[PDB]
Paper text:
The Notch signalling pathway is conserved across all metazoan species and plays key roles in many aspects of cell biology including cell‐fate determination, stem cell maintenance, immune system activation and angiogenesis in humans (Guruharsha et al, 2012; Bray, 2016). Aberrant Notch signalling results in a number of inherited and acquired disorders, including various cancers, and it is therefore a key target for therapeutic intervention (Hansson et al, 2004; Groth & Fortini, 2012). Both the Notch receptors and the ligands are single‐pass type I transmembrane proteins, and direct protein–protein contact between adjacent cells initiates an intracellular signalling pathway. All of the Notch ligands have a modular extracellular architecture consisting of an N‐terminal C2 domain (formerly known as the MNNL domain), a Delta/Serrate/Lag‐2 (DSL) domain, and either 16 (Jagged1/Jagged2), 8 (Delta‐like1/Delta‐like4) or 7 (Delta‐like3) EGF repeats. Binding of a Notch ligand to EGF11‐12 of a Notch receptor results in a series of proteolytic cleavages, with the final intra‐membrane cleavage by gamma secretase, causing the release of the intracellular domain of Notch (NICD) from the plasma membrane.
Numbering used by the authors: 27 to 51, 62, 65 to 153, 158 to 334
Write the structure that this text describes.
C-alpha cells in the first residue's frame, strides 16, 4: 500500500571516532546506517522496537563520504520491483500494508562494521508528521561525532491513493469494467461507458432506454414487445388490422371498429352500406344491419 523512503546523501566523521569517545582503530571506520521506524508517542519517547519497520545499509565508505543524487524517474521500480542485490545502497525502503498514521518517530544510527553495541558512531532521532507527498524532505544533523544529511519521503504504492494509502484504484478494461483511475483514485469511465463501476454502456443516441438496451456501446436492442431503431414503438397484437398499440400486444381499435383484431365493422351502414331505394339503414351487430 505504501513505503517510507530514506536517501542518505552525506555522512561526515572527520575525527573517525565512535560515539563512546573511543577510536575506530584518531585507520578508518567502516560506516553503515540503520533506520528505525516506530510509533510516535507523547512524553513516553523511549519504548523499544521499530514497530513501523526497519532498514539497514551495507558499508558505504570510510569516515566521511558523499552519495550521488538519484533520478526523478524510476523512483517506483527502483524501490519496489528488483531482484536480490538491490544495487543501490543508501536508499532505505520500508514498505507498509496498513493505514499510514502520518505521525511517526524516525531514529537513524551510524555504525562501525568490524567482523556488539560499543561500535555506534552516531544516533539521531526525529519525531514528526508527514503525508504521502511525492516531494522529498531534507533533514540535517550535527551530533557529537558525525554529521548527516538525510532525505525522507512517504509514498503510496501504485494504484493506492489518499493521505493514508488505503483507497484502491487500478485501471481496467475487461469483463467487469472499462475505466482508468485519476489523481485522487476515482474511476474515470472510458468513452462509451458509464456507471458507478464504469460497467454500463452508452447505447445508440435516441434509444428509448425504458424498453431498449445495449451490450456494446452504440447499440439499441429492444425488449420483448417493442420494436424500431430506437425501441420506442410497441408491437401490436399480431393480426391487428384496424387498431393500434400504446403498450405491447394491444389492439386498440379505431372509430366504429371492434372485435379482437379490429376487423369487424360496427358502423356497416354509415360506410360501404347496403340500403335500397333511399330508405333507412340502422347498424345492428358487427357486419350486420337493418335497412327499411
Amino acid at each position: 500500500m505504501g513505503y517510507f523512503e530514506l536517501q542518505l546523501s552525506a555522512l561526515r566523521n572527520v575525527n573517525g571516532e565512535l560515539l563512546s569517545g573511543a577510536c575506530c582503530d584518531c585507520d578508518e571506520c567502516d560506516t553503515y546506517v540503520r533506520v528505525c521506524l516506530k510509533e510516535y508517542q507523547a512524553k513516553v519517547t523511549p519504548t523499544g522496537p521499530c514497530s513501523y519497520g526497519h532498514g539497514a545499509t551495507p558499508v558505504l565508505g570510510g569516515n566521511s563520504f558523499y552519495l550521488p543524487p538519484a533520478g526523478a524517474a524510476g523512483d517506483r521500480a527502483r524501490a519496489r520491483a528488483r531482484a536480490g542485490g538491490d544495487q543501490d545502497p543508501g536508499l532505505v525502503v520500508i514498505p507498509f500494508q496498513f493505514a499510514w498514521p502520518r505521525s511517526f518517530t524516525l531514529i537513524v544510527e551510524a555504525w562501525d562494521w568490524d567482523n556488539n553495541e560499543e561500535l555506534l558512531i552516531e544516533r539521531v532521532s526525529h519525531a514528526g508528521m508527514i503525508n504521502p507527498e511525492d516531494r522529498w524532505k531534507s533533514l540535517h544533523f550535527s551530533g557529537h561525532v558525525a554529521h548527516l544529511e538525510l532525505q525522507i519521503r512517504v509514498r503510496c504504492d501504485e494504484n493506492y491513493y489518499s493521505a493514508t494509502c488505503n483507497k484502491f484504484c487500478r485501471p481496467r478494461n475487461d469483463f467487469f469494467g472499462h475505466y482508468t483511475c485519476d489523481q485522487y483514485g476515482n474511476k474515470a469511465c472510458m468513452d462509451g461507458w458509464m456507471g458507478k463501476e464504469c460497467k454500463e454502456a452508452v447505447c445508440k443516441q435516441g434509444c428509448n432506454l425504458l424498453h431498449g438496451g445495449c451490450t456494446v456501446p452504440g447499440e439499441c436492442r429492444c425488449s420483448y414487445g417493442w420494436q424500431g431503431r430506437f425501441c420506442d414503438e410497441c408491437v401490436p397484437y399480431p393480426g391487428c388490422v384496424h387498431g393500434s398499440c400504446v403498450e405491447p400486444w394491444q389492439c386498440n381499435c379505431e372509430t366504429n371498429w371492434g372485435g379482437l383484431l379490429c376487423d369487424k365493422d360496427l358502423n356497416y351502414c354509415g360506410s360501404h352500406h347496403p340500403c335500397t331505394n333511399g330508405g333507412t339503414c340502422i347498424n345492428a351487430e358487427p357486419d350486420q344491419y337493418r335497412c327499411t
